[PDB]
Amino acid sequence: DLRLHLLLNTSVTCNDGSPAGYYLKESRGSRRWLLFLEGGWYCFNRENCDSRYDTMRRLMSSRDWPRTRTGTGILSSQPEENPYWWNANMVFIPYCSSDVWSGASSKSEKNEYAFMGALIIQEVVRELLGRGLSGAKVLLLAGSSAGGTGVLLNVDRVAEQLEKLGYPAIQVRGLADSGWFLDNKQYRHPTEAIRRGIRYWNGVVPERCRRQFQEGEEWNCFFGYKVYPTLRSPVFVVQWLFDEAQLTVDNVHVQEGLRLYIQNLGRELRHTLKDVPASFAPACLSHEIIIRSHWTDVQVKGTSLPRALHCWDRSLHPLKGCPVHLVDSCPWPHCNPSCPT
Ligand SMILES: *[C@@H]1O[C@H](CO)[C@@H](O)[C@H](O)[C@H]1NC(C)=O
Ligand SMILES: COc1ccc(-c2cc[nH]n2)c(O)c1
Numbered sequence: 001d002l003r004l005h006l007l008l009n010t011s012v013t014c015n016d017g018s019p020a021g022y023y024l025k026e027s028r029g030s031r032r033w034l035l036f037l038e039g040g041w042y043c044f045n046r047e048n049c050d051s052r053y054d055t056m057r058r059l060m061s062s063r064d065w066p067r068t069r070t071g072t073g074i075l076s077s078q079p080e081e082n083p084y085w086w087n088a089n090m091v092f093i094p095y096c097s098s099d100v101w102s103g104a105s106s107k108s109e110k111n112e113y114a115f116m117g118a119l120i121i122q123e124v125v126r127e128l129l130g131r132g133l134s135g136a137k138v139l140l141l142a143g144s145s146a147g148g149t150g151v152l153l154n155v156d157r158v159a160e161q162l163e164k165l166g167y168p169a170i171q172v173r174g175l176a177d178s179g180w181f182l183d184n185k186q187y188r189h190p191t192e193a194i195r196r197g198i199r200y201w202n203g204v205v206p207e208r209c210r211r212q213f214q215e216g217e218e219w220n221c222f223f224g225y226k227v228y229p230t231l232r233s234p235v236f237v238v239q240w241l242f243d244e245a246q247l248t249v250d251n252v253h254v255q256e257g258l259r260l261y262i263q264n265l266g267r268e269l270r271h272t273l274k275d276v277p278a279s280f281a282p283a284c285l286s287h288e289i290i291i292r293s294h295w296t297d298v299q300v301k302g303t304s305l306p307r308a309l310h311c312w313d314r315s316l317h318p319l320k321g322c323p324v325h326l327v328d329s330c331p332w333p334h335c336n337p338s339c340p341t
Helices: 046-055 117-129 146-165 190-203 209-213 218-222 225-230 244-249 256-272 305-315
Strands: 003-006 023-025 032-037 087-095 138-145 171-177 235-238 279-281 326-328
Touching: 003 087, 003 209, 003 218, 023 256, 032 117, 032 146, 046 146, 087 117, 117 146, 117 256, 138 146, 146 218, 146 235, 171 225, 209 218, 209 225, 218 225
Parallel strands: 032 087, 032 138, 138 171, 171 235, 235 279, 279 326
Antiparallel strands: 003 023, 023 087
């Protein structure tokens, strides 16, 4: 079990002003640290944040969080469940900022809510340095869904933070699960919600990407295929080719028109990953994977996700029999027999 710690700097807060925090299980025989960002959509104005506060309050407040959480999947300490990193130090960072981990705005007399996701990540890193992170060899910042997009937005800022604090030996890397979306045409009739959100949150994006797209166009940096080329830290991308959240936003719930739409979506996703050397993209209809208990089951070309991540670790010291770029070529959901049922 991972144990809750509320942030000692109580000015770094969830949406409603309660302290943010993290859940931790230390492994004193290991110099590997895994910091996982939870997902859970977002809110973008007063009225829809108020609705979220009524029925999704754990995503906006720490007042009701439990003392412990069970580590599952990549956060599990059991070798049978986690062949990749079972002996690592484990951290689960709850998502209570509703801002895709991008915000840097405090509650005030003009702001009903605080959007502090980017600051929460940096404060967790700071407080962990006193609990053993100072001795780390590798810090892997991982996340699923909104947390996966959060990895892409924040991994280089964590690398910069540690360099500036005097820890240039810690190797910072990212693992983005189910956060790689396409700003495509919908099947039936979007990006305007992200544009409004960024202004509402005082959202921040990585430097190089912001310099490319410039003022007013920072929403572009929330799309993996546009922000990834600007990143300096190594990032492994996990994305189902027919992601359920992508299809929901596309208004897809089979005749020729829909068949061609679905096949084109898989082809476009595969194209965006052609030049991503560390990636895992199966031809399945699903959403999220890395903290699911059965994340060991899926395979692409005969290689499981835990194996591909281990091969990635070796590459950061092509490898015979140990691949790191694994993207399905078959064009319909569940043409891969190992897809989740
Ligand atoms: C607490 O966090 C806020 C926001 O990041 C920062 O302005 C302040 O300096 C921090 N306090 C300390 C003691 O580091
Ligand atoms: C699931 O996340 C998504 C998926 C798709 C879009 C999008 C934007 C324009 N077209 N489609 C998005 O903004 C978020």
